[PDB]
Amino acid sequence: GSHSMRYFHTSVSRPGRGEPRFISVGYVDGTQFVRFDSDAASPRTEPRAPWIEQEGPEYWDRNTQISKTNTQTYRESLRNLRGYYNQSEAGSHTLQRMYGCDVGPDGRLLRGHDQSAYDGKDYIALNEDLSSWTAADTAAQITQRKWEAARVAEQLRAYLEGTCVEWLRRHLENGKETLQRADPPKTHVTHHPISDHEATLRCWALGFYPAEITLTWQRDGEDQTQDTELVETRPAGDRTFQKWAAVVVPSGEEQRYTCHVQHEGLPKPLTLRWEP
Amino acid sequence: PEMTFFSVK
Amino acid sequence: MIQRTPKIQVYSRHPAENGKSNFLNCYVSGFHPSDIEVDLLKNGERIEKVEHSDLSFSKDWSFYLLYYTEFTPTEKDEYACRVNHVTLSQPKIVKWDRDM
Ligand code: NA
Ligand code: NA
Ligand code: NA
Ligand code: NA
């Protein structure tokens, strides 16, 4: 299928408590593989998946230098943003950025990304053309003017079409035993009485990877989206994910309800009913 | 590897 | 500031089998800003060996963290997750319910 590599950068000011913390985490699809944290006793890029551990010293040192540099750039960014919004020196603020590439089944670039947000609001983003910017407000237009003069989009484009796609393809190969393995969900329907009149049917999906799944309840074949409690997909802790969906049904109408599960790891989409 | 972000905001 | 209050799910890695070892999870998501305090509780007391994931965030910029610890369920013991965040007037406690 399609694949992506993404980096998630969080920088948080903390006036009175040192300089802004900078953390970068890298993902291939749903699999975290690196971290850097300026608050570690010895900040360095560190492996967080087994397959990346075979990269050599020069990979780790190059990434560590990049993240120490990015640490300084985000701290200067945070000072500038404070000026752009006329904000006091006394408050804590957050600067986030996510960037990376998506590739198709044939390894070709599908699209690149480079988005930033300030205090939780979209601030500036590289457009899909990888050549122009969308600024959210007059503050971000100042950033846009700086980045146009410094030709940041051209340099981002080079990274995204070159390094990012090449290294995503390398990681996918080195980690193929996990990254290119879809694990299907283990599924069950549980039944939880509420009262004499109603009961909860809960459809479980456990242990699956990647996180993408469709888990739906139908009544006489009509989707029950409006009456379904669908919890957010949640990490199990072992790289896999979990999800469930529940509907409240009239007592004795259980068999009119079917749970349908679609996941890349299943040989066939699943149709589940309550088996008492 | 990561990208070094060419400018402060 | 945009501020977003956390969602909290408390659950086990594997379906719970009284007496069989397992992992207790507290997954906090959808919140902003990133400062948050999370404790895993056993019979109202704070568990000491609790690991957590590296801070990351979703497509809508909201943060998420997974706190976890090894544990062995039993009929008498009650586990919970206690979360504090600037958006909450008091720390929220969520009890582990093995059917959720
Ligand atoms: Na600071
Ligand atoms: Na290493
Ligand atoms: Na700031
Ligand atoms: Na932000």
Numbering used by the authors:
A (entry chain A): 1 to 276
B (entry chain C): 1 to 9
C (entry chain B): 1 to 100
Give verbatim excerpts from the published study on this entry.
We then solved the X-ray crystal structure for the HLA-B*18:01-PB1177-B complex at a resolution of 2.0 Å. PB1177-B adopts a canonical conformation within the binding cleft, consistent with HLA-I binding. The PB1177-B side chains P2-Glu and P9-Lys are the primary anchors within the B and F pockets, respectively. P9-Lys at the PΩ anchor is non-canonical for HLA-B*18:01, with this molecule preferring large hydrophobic residues at this position, as per previously published structures. The crystal structure showed that P5-Phe was buried into the D pocket. The P4-Thr, P6-Phe, P7-Ser and P8-Val side chains were solvent exposed, forming a large surface for potential TCR contacts. Strikingly, there was high flexibility of the peptide central region, from P5-Phe to P7-Ser, as reflected by the weak electron density for the two residues. P5-Phe facing down in the cleft may be inducing this flexibility due to the unfavourable interaction between this large hydrophobic residue and the positively charged Arg97 side chain at the base of the C pocket. The melting temperature of the HLA-B*18:01-PB1177-B complex was ~49°C. The ensemble refinement for PB1177-B also shows the large flexibility of P6-Phe, which can ‘shield’ P3-Met and P4-Thr, which could potentially limit TCR interaction.
CD8+ T cell activation is driven by the recognition of human leukocyte antigen class I molecules (HLA-I) on the surface of infected cells. Viral peptides are loaded onto the HLA within the cell, and this step required a stable peptide HLA (pHLA) complex. The stable pHLA complexes are then transported to the surface where they can be displayed to CD8+ T cells, recognised via their T cell receptor (TCR). Our work focuses on HLA-B*18:01 that is expressed in around 2.3% of the world’s population, spanning various continents.
